[PDB]
Amino acid sequence: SVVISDAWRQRFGGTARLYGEKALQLFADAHICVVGIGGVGSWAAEALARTGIGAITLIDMDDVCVTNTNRQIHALRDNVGLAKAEVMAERIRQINPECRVTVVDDFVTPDNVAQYMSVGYSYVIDAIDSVRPKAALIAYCRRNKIPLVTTGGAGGQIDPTQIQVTDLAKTIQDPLAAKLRERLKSDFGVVKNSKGKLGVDCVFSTEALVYPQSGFGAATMVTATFGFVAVSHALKKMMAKAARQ
Amino acid sequence: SVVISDAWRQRFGGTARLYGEKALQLFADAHICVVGIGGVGSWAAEALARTGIGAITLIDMDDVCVTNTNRQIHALRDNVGLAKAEVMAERIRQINPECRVTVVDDFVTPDNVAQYMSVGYSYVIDAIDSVRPKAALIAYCRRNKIPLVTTGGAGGQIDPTQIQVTDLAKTIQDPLAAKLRERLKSDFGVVKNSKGKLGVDCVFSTEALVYPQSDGTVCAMKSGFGAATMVTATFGFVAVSHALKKMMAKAARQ
Ligand SMILES: Nc1ncnc2c1ncn2[C@@H]1O[C@H](COP(=O)(O)O)[C@@H](O)[C@H]1O
Ligand SMILES: Nc1ncnc2c1ncn2[C@@H]1O[C@H](COP(=O)(O)O)[C@@H](O)[C@H]1O
Numbered sequence: 468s469v470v471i472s473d474a475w476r477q478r479f480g481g482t483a484r485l486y487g488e489k490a491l492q493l494f495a496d497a498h499i500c501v502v503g504i505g506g507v508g509s510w511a512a513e514a515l516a517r518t519g520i521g522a523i524t525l526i527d528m529d530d531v532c533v534t535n536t537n538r539q540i541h542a543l544r545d546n547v548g549l550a551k552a553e554v555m556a557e558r559i560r561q562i563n564p565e566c567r568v569t570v571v572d573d574f575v576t577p578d579n580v581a582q583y584m585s586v587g588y589s590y591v592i593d594a595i596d597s598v599r600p601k602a603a604l605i606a607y608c609r610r611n612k613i614p615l616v617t618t619g620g621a622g623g624q625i626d627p628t629q630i631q632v633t634d635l636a637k638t639i640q641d642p643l644a645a646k647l648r649e650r651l652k653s654d655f656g657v658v659k660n661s662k663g664k665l666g667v668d669c670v671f672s673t674e675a676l677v678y679p680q681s682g683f684g685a686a687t688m689v690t691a692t693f694g695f696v697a698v699s700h701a702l703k704k705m706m707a708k709a710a711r712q
Numbered sequence: 713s714v715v716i717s718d719a720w721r722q723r724f725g726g727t728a729r730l731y732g733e734k735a736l737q738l739f740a741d742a743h744i745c746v747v748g749i750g751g752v753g754s755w756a757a758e759a760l761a762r763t764g765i766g767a768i769t770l771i772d773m774d775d776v777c778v779t780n781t782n783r784q785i786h787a788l789r790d791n792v793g794l795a796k797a798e799v800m801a802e803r804i805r806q807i808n809p810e811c812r813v814t815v816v817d818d819f820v821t822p823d824n825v826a827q828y829m830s831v832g833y834s835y836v837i838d839a840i841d842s843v844r845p846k847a848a849l850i851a852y853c854r855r856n857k858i859p860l861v862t863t864g865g866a867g868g869q870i871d872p873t874q875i876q877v878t879d880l881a882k883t884i885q886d887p888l889a890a891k892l893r894e895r896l897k898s899d900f901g902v903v904k905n906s907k908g909k910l911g912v913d914c915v916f917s918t919e920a921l922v923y924p925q926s927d928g929t930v931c932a933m934k935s936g937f938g939a940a941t942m943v944t945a946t947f948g949f950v951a952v953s954h955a956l957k958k959m960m961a962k963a964a965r966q
Contacts, residue, residue, distance in 0.1 A: 474778070481782040485870065485938025488928035510945075517782055517941040533719075536807060537726040537762055540785075543806040561788040562781060625730065625957070627949050628876050677730060684730025687762040688949035695872050695942035703870070 469495040469521045475565060479519040490706055491519060497589040497705065498522035498567075502575055502604055504551040505529075506538040506685055507618045508594030511694035512555050513540050515592075516562040518702065523559060525552040526571040526583060538690045575600045580607045590701040593617040594694065598646045605635075605647070606655035609667055614704060616697045619644040619671035623683035626674045627692040632700050635669040644671055670696045714740040714766045720810060724764035731960070736764060738963050742834040743767035743812075744955070747820055747849060749796045750774075751783040751939055752863050753839030755948035758785055760837075761804040763956065767812040768804060770797040771828060773819050779935075783944045822848040829858055835955045838862040839948065843891050844899075850880075850892070850912055851900035859958065861951045864889040864916035867937030872946040874919040877954045880912040885920050885934060913958075915951045917943070 471492065476483070483491040497520050501508045504527040515523050529551050535542035541554045552570045559568050571583060575595065580603055584591070591608055593615060595601040601617070608615040617635065620643030636659055638644040651657035651665070659665055670693050676683065716737065721728070728736040742765050746753045749772040760768050774796050780787035786799040801813040820828060820840065825848050829836070836853055838860060840846045846862070853860040862880065865888035881904050883889040893910070896902040904910055920934040930938070 477778045478781040480779060481938040482940065483928065483938065484924040484936075485868065485922060485930065485940055487930045513785075514941045514945075517787075519782070533722045534725060536723040537764070540758075543803070544809060545806060558788070561790060564789060622726075623730065625953060627946060627953055631873050679729045680732040680735075681725065681729065684726040684728065686727065686730055686953070687759045688953045691759075692872065692946050692949055695946055699870060699872055699940070699942045 468492065471495050472565060475519070478563060482519045486706065493705060493709055494519045494702070495521040498524070498586065499590045499592060499701065500524040500526060500588045501592045501594060502526045503594035503596065504541070504555050505594060505596060506690035507621050507694040507697070508592065509540040509551070509555060509694070510691035511592050511594055511698050512559065514695050514698040516559045516566060518698070519563070520566070522567040524569040524571060524586065524588070525555055526573065526575060527552045528572055528574050538685045538687050575604045577603045580604060584608065584611070584613055588613065589705060591615045592697050592701060598643065598650050601647055602650040602654060605667055606651060606657055609657065614701070616668050616670065616701050618693050618697055619669055621690040621693040622685040623676040623678065624672050624674045624689045625677060625686060626672070627688050629672040629674040630670060630689070630692050630696050631673065632668055632670050632696060634664045635667040636663055636665045638669050638671040639673060640675050641671045642676070644669060668700065670700065716740055717810060720764070723808060727764045734963070735960055738959060739764045739956070740766040742959065743769070743832070744835045744837065745769040745771065745833045746837045746839060747771045748839040748841065749786070749800050750839060750841065751944035752866050752947045753837065754785045754796070754800060755945035756837045756839060756952050757800050757804065759949050759952040761807040761811060763952070764808070765811070769814040769816060769831070769833070770800055771816040771818065771820060772797040773817055783939045783941050820845045820849050825849055825852045829853065829856065833858065834959060836860045837951050837955065843888070843895055847892060847895035847899060851896060851902055854902065854912055859955070860912065861954050862912055862914045863947050863951055864914055865937070866944040866947040867939045868921035868923065869917050869919045869943045870922065870940060871917070871919050872942050874917045875915060875943070875946050875950050876918070877913055877915050877950060879909040880914040881908055881910045883914055883916040885918055886916045887921065889914055889916055913954060915947050915954070
């Protein structure tokens, strides 16, 4: 158990008053991994930090680019050209200097997923944009019962109020999620239950895609909300599991 | 009005691809005011900046406090003690160096509201928590046809997916929004029209508020409330997306 300090309580007293004290300690003791520190994952990382999560691992190899400005929290003039995960880590340490932050400067693949998951996370937030590594991460967590929430495509969507969580089998208006389902079936043997579920929780939006007016565009208001919904869902699941003993 | 530089196109190419070039220009030419740079308003400011809005005014007099950390984007160890609005303005300059940012180092009151709205904003996002100034800001915007979105209480709520926008007359499970309607009726004579509406768009949540108990548990019931970034920021984001939707619709009409 992480020892909650007096400074921690000043930072996160609003967390305790919202989730309860038991949950404050649960979060302080958690270790959550965010894979992909982009339009969705950067805001998920931010949210975790600001809700008193005591250890966070960030996995990404990309650099901050000027084109990230429309949708990524780390995308500032002075950060362009630096490694996203490390820039996000430094920010998290400014949020909570007592958070233990680990950076994995790499992409997830079939060959390294086991090693990177071997840490033993309380949750994994999958915010990867590419379908191949995405499928590899999901298939691994799902087989190994590692708690996971995945995110669909957040581009080409303008309305944050249509974001919701459902089984990956049941998402609509999400070409990324659809390709992911195909890849999981074809490459990993993952297929629906008797109930028609893949047993993978997925943040998506019912909104129909808005085609490009350099692929689909994106907006902070939606991409960040994907990440915030993923975090709220993960924390809810962790609190329910803990109450179920 | 604003000539979009190549740097600006690089920053906001994703914005253009989502909303169109005409919208990119509309946003570059816009001037939006954020009142209250806190749990809701700091994220609304961030979103405006990140959506290529060309001018932003920020109104607040408070300083960054360590207790802001759970829900405000400017709450970082090195910023504690500095004025919230100025820290945010400085961040907005890092997002878009060509954004025109104005800091009003003050609180809105019944007596100064006309001066602070007199500028001619494309939109006002009201993220003030205190009720009497909030009522005064809304009454003034509403009377003067100044495009406004207001935000109910984002504290005591955990679910970002229940946030939506409706007329202030129709909000539920929002005690702030209900005390507001009263102050507006009582001090400004703002009351429902015959269709049941106040003519004020409000971000609110259908979620029942969660109240902290003396024993450290919390109890949902249909320094006060706790809060979470995931919910407070999404209030701000839903406000911004609503405003931009309305602005684009207005521009489509001509
Ligand atoms: N296989 C992977 N493992 C970890 N992070 C990834 C992987 N593939 C893509 N990413 C990151 O996912 C992020 C996507 O963000 P965005 O560009 O907004 O969709 C980027 O920062 C990528 O570098
Ligand atoms: N009358 C006012 N005019 C402008 N900003 C205000 C006023 N009253 C409160 N605020 C700010 O509104 C913000 C509310 O943030 P929060 O504490 O997260 O609700 C704080 O930064 C306050 O300083």
